[PDB]
């Protein structure tokens, strides 16, 4: 019970940061170099 | 003739082929039946 | 290893050395494991029969012994058409 | 009856080995694409 | 390969699990980074 104000603060902070990120980085991470004339993402051995 | 005999219409998908991976080749023999190297009669099947 | 002389010839539109017998070992088999070092040691007595067979009938093409361990031994010796990584392609061949 | 147990798993390879051992056969394990060429070609050593 | 005597030569690595797109890589008996050979390495591993 006594964690109620802390829970509300965490919820409000998560909401603010979600909205901020939604404004700034909305749709940027949608490009990666495939192979030319191919739909195979090109990465080195251990890269993600 | 020295070319390998074919089966079905060939279909290759370029969009899913890395550039340098050396997709392998075939080991099939050249098995061309007798009634497929000439025109088939009802007499040539008898001779065969 | 042996370094050959590799004269050129007809009946093989490539380079050929009639003095010893080549050897081909699948790429993913170690060339120096004990199971292949014996198949390389006891098959060293085939080259005499290879040479005799060709000396009798001079018009013979490849004579090959393909053992149950991948090790192939053919005569006359000739560089394999596909090295491991000297071209851009690899060699997926297996006598079995 | 040659019996091939393919892939990696936590199942019981007992009855399959028994079928192989009883009916003049052989039991092969294929846990990867690497071990496919040398396992699907060894049954000849049993037919000889 | 289950021994340091066997882990030599080259082997095939298949990209995307595609058995028709392979590369050659030399195999090597690699000792894990964090191990348990001595109490020093074991204390390091337990620390991590």
Curated annotation (Swiss-Prot), chain A:
Tissue pattern of expression reads: Detected in skeletal muscle T-tubules (at protein level).
Q: How is it modified after translation?
A: Phosphorylated. Phosphorylation by PKA activates the calcium channel. Both the minor and major forms are phosphorylated in vitro by PKA.
Subcellular location(s) per record: Cell membrane, Sarcolemma, T-tubule
| Transmembrane feature ranges | 4-25
Free-text note regarding domains: Each of the four internal repeats contains five hydrophobic transmembrane segments (S1, S2, S3, S5, S6) and one positively charged transmembrane segment (S4). S4 segments probably represent the voltage-sensor and are characterized by a series of positively charged amino acids at every third position. The loop between repeats II and III interacts with the ryanodine receptor, and is therefore important for calcium release from the endoplasmic reticulum necessary for muscle contraction.
Q: What does this protein do?
A: Pore-forming, alpha-1S subunit of the voltage-gated calcium channel that gives rise to L-type calcium currents in skeletal muscle. Calcium channels containing the alpha-1S subunit play an important role in excitation-contraction coupling in skeletal muscle via their interaction with RYR1, which triggers Ca(2+) release from the sarcplasmic reticulum and ultimately results in muscle contraction. Long-lasting (L-type) calcium channels belong to the 'high-voltage activated' (HVA) group.
**Subunit composition?**
Component of a calcium channel complex consisting of a pore-forming alpha subunit (CACNA1S) and the ancillary subunits CACNB1 or CACNB2, CACNG1 and CACNA2D1. The channel complex contains alpha, beta, gamma and delta subunits in a 1:1:1:1 ratio, i.e. it contains either CACNB1 or CACNB2. CACNA1S channel activity is modulated by the auxiliary subunits (CACNB1 or CACNB2, CACNG1 and CACNA2D1). Interacts with DYSF and JSRP1. Interacts with RYR1. Interacts with STAC, STAC2 and STAC3 (via their SH3 domains). Interaction with STAC3 promotes expression at the cell membrane.
What the record says about family reads: Belongs to the calcium channel alpha-1 subunit (TC 1.A.1.11) family. CACNA1S subfamily.
**Full protein name:** Voltage-dependent L-type calcium channel subunit alpha-1S
Species of provenance: Oryctolagus cuniculus
UniProtKB/Swiss-Prot annotation, chain C:
On tissue specificity, the annotation reads: Skeletal muscle.
Residues annotated as glycosylated = 41
Modification note: Proteolytically processed into subunits alpha-2-1 and delta-1 that are disulfide-linked.
Localization of this protein: Membrane; Cell membrane
Written domain comment of the UniProt record: The MIDAS-like motif in the VWFA domain binds divalent metal cations and is required to promote trafficking of the alpha-1 (CACNA1) subunit to the plasma membrane by an integrin-like switch.
Its annotated function is as follows: The alpha-2/delta subunit of voltage-dependent calcium channels regulates calcium current density and activation/inactivation kinetics of the calcium channel. Plays an important role in excitation-contraction coupling.
Q: What else is known?
A: Binds gabapentin, an antiepileptic drug.
Instruction: State the family named in the UniProt similarity comment for this chain.
Output: Belongs to the calcium channel subunit alpha-2/delta family.
Protein name listed in UniProt: Voltage-dependent calcium channel subunit alpha-2/delta-1
């Amino acid at each position: 019970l006594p964690l109620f104000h802390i829970a509300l603060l965490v919820l409000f902070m998560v909401i603010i940061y979600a909205i901020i990120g939604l404004e700034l980085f909305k749709g940027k991470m949608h490009k990666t170099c495939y192979y030319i004339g191919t739909d195979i993402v090109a990465t080195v051995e251990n890269e993600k | 003739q020295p070319k390998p005999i074919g089966v079905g219409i060939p279909t290759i998908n370029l969009r899913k082929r890395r550039p340098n991976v050396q997709n392998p080749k075939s080991q099939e023999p050249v098995t061309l039946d007798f009634l497929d190297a000439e025109l088939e009669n009802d007499i040539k099947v008898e001779i065969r | 290893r042996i370094k050959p002389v590799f004269i050129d010839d007809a009946n093989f539109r490539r380079q050929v050395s009639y003095q010893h017998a080549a050897v081909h070992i699948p790429t993913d088999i170690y060339e120096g494991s004990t199971i292949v070092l014996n198949e390389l040691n006891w098959t060293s007595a085939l080259d005499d029969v290879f040479k005799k067979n060709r000396e009798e009938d001079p018009s013979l093409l490849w004579q090959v012994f393909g053992s149950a361990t991948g090790l192939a031994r053919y005569y006359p010796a000739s560089p394999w058409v596909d090295n491991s990584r000297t071209p851009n392609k690899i060699d997926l061949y297996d006598v079995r | 009856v040659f019996t091939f147990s393919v892939g990696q798993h936590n199942y019981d390879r007992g009855p399959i080995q028994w079928m192989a051992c009883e009916n003049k056969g052989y039991y092969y394990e294929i846990p990867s694409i690497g071990a496919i060429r040398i396992n699907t070609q060894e049954y000849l050593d049993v037919l000889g | 390969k289950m021994t340091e005597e066997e882990c030599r030569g080259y082997y095939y690595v298949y990209k995307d699990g595609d058995p028709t797109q392979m590369e050659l890589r030399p195999r090597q008996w690699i000792h894990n980074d964090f191990h348990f050979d001595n109490v020093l390495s074991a204390m390091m591993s337990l620390f991590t």
